[PDB]
Amino acid sequence: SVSSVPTKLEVVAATPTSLLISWDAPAVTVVHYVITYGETGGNSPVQEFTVPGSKSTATISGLKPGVDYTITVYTMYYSYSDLYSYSSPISINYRT
Amino acid sequence: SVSSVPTKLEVVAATPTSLLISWDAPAVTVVHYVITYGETGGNSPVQEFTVPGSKSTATISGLKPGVDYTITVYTMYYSYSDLYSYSSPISINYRT
Amino acid sequence: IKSLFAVIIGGSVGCTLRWLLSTKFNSLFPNLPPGTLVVNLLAGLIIGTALAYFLRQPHLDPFWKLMITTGLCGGLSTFATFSVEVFALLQAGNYIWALTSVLVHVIGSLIMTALGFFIITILFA
Amino acid sequence: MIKSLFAVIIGGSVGCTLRWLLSTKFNSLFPNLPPGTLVVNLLAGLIIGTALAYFLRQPHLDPFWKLMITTGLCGGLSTFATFSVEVFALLQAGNYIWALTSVLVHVIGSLIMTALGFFIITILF
Ligand SMILES: CCCCCCCCCCO[C@@H]1O[C@H](CO)[C@@H](O[C@H]2O[C@H](CO)[C@@H](O)[C@H](O)[C@H]2O)[C@H](O)[C@H]1O
Ligand SMILES: CCCCCCCCCCO[C@@H]1O[C@H](CO)[C@@H](O[C@H]2O[C@H](CO)[C@@H](O)[C@H](O)[C@H]2O)[C@H](O)[C@H]1O
Ligand SMILES: CCCCCCCCCCO[C@@H]1O[C@H](CO)[C@@H](O[C@H]2O[C@H](CO)[C@@H](O)[C@H](O)[C@H]2O)[C@H](O)[C@H]1O
Ligand SMILES: [Br-]
Ligand SMILES: [Br-]
Ligand SMILES: [F-]
Ligand SMILES: [F-]
Ligand code: NA
């Protein structure tokens, strides 16, 4: 009954080629977060990287100016029933 | 199949009114040894005291000179099958 | 065989209790799942009471002793779930709550075993 | 919940029976740290570690099987309560050096078997 998806994903600071994102930790043991991003126009390879379970912010670099990006975060988390498993993503869009 | 009964019970030193007894610990976890002693002849009250499981010697005091004494030792030990239980006794006779 | 039924019957009751308690309560405080802790503390209290009580009743059927200890306390408590919870916290970088879980489970279980033992010991005296 | 209940009872009985058989054969061989209680805690730590990495890569496994391997087998196989009285008995016997050793080997050793179980399947996959 306890959601393992992060909440309140948002860009808190932005340059034309980078984004500072942050989110609220879910109420479970998160081993690490996985951040996905890519150009919204489904004509670009999506990239993924991890940040430790203790962090709740991440910098996305190497972006293009004035381009629409889709950014998602999900968790690799421990729970009693499922041991390690991946949560559904939370997703936002942001134009640099 | 491992005996909890002490072996090689013997008097190592004596005075007219006292006895210093020693024994070999059994191959278990003894919590304490019970030492009992009484006058071998007829109806004299057997007395008993406890000795911590780490010690393998004990002093018996307040005896009468020139009297036959029956001395027995048994353990209060822990084992997996029986939790806390008592072993059978090992017994010797000694005349002060 | 009669001993096998004591372990199976006692273990099934202990495992069933651990499964129900852990699911209902582990998610309430994931830094130290209280369902896994409670089954470990309760199994210690019981095994401590059983330690003192069985010492003074040497004529008890070994069938009852084996069902309450190797059975119930064995199915009820767990070291494996305790393990993954600490392992998961260690991989999560939450070192302080990994150590705390280790201390609370070990120190806390030995105390409940003492309580079960001395309460029965003080009562018989 | 009834199908889930059968998963707990079946795997738990196999774990409890395994723990009961291994303990009665090997514990008395070395009373300062009974190796049967250790081995079932190490083994359950190993299995739960492999389960940790394997279940992560097989998210569509029937919860019936995941419940039977962890809460059932590992839960019934491992034990915290018998580990408690062993340390308690050693403390009451004044054997502190082996009480502390028993506490460390079980805790440190179960986590390592959990890590070994996790990292082996992770390196394989
Ligand atoms: C976090 C808490 C840590 C501390 C826990 C308590 C430790 C101190 C206990 C004090 O009371 C003890 O009670 C024992 C009985 O329960 C007595 O054993 C006496 O009787 C026992 C048998 O009942 C024998 O095994 C013992 O050797 C013999 O000393 C012992 O003398 C006495 O001092
Ligand atoms: C008492 C001993 C018990 C037996 C040994 C148990 C060992 C358990 C932890 C091992 O797992 C590793 O732990 C690292 C530390 O949590 C993780 O680092 C991850 O998180 C760190 C957080 O600071 C980052 O710095 C790393 O880059 C990142 O890989 C890493 O992924 C993980 O595989
Ligand atoms: C850090 C977590 C702690 C969790 C709780 C731990 C509880 C420990 C219980 C210890 O039980 C006591 O241990 C004493 C020491 O072994 C015994 O003394 C007995 O044995 C001693 C050692 O040989 C002698 O010095 C004493 O005189 C003799 O009474 C005593 O009977 C016994 O009840
Ligand atoms: Br047990
Ligand atoms: Br488990
Ligand atoms: F374990
Ligand atoms: F326990
Ligand atoms: Na168990």
Numbering used by the authors:
A (entry chain D), B (entry chain C): 1 to 96
C (entry chain A): 2 to 126
D (entry chain B): 1 to 125
Original paper wording:
Microbes are protected from the cytoplasmic accumulation of environmental fluoride ion (F-) by export of the toxic anion via fluoride channels known as Flucs. These small, homodimeric ion channels are remarkable proteins in two regards: first, their unusual ‘dual-topology’ architecture, in which the two subunits of the homodimer are arranged antiparallel with respect to each other, yielding a double-barreled pair of pores related by twofold symmetry; second, the Flucs stand out among anion channels for their extreme substrate selectivity. In contrast to most characterized families of anion channels, which tend to be non-selective among anions and sometimes poorly discriminate against cations, the Flucs are arguably the most selective ion channels known, with >10,000-fold selectivity against the biologically abundant chloride. The protein possesses two deep, aqueous vestibules with an electropositive character due to an absolutely conserved arginine sidechain and a deeply buried sodium ion at the center of the protein.
In order to probe the role of the anion-coordinating sidechains in more detail, we mutated Fluc-Ec2’s bromide-coordinating Ser81 to alanine, threonine, or cysteine, and also constructed a S81A/T82A double mutant. For all four mutants, we measured fluoride channel activity using either single-channel electrophysiology or bulk liposome efflux experiments, and we solved x-ray crystal structures of the mutants together with Br-. The functional experiments showed that fluoride throughput is inhibited in these mutants. S81A had a mild effect, with a ~50% decrease in conductance to 3.7 ± 0.4 pS (seven single-channel measurements), compared to 7 pS for the WT protein. In accord with the fluoride transport experiments, a strong anomalous peak persisted in the S81A structure but was weaker in the S81A/T82A double mutant. In both cases, the densities shifted away from the channel center toward the external solution, moving about 2 Å closer to the vestibule Arg22s. The hydrogen bond between the fluoride and the vestibule serine seems to be dispensable, and mutant channels with an alanine at the position retain robust fluoride currents.
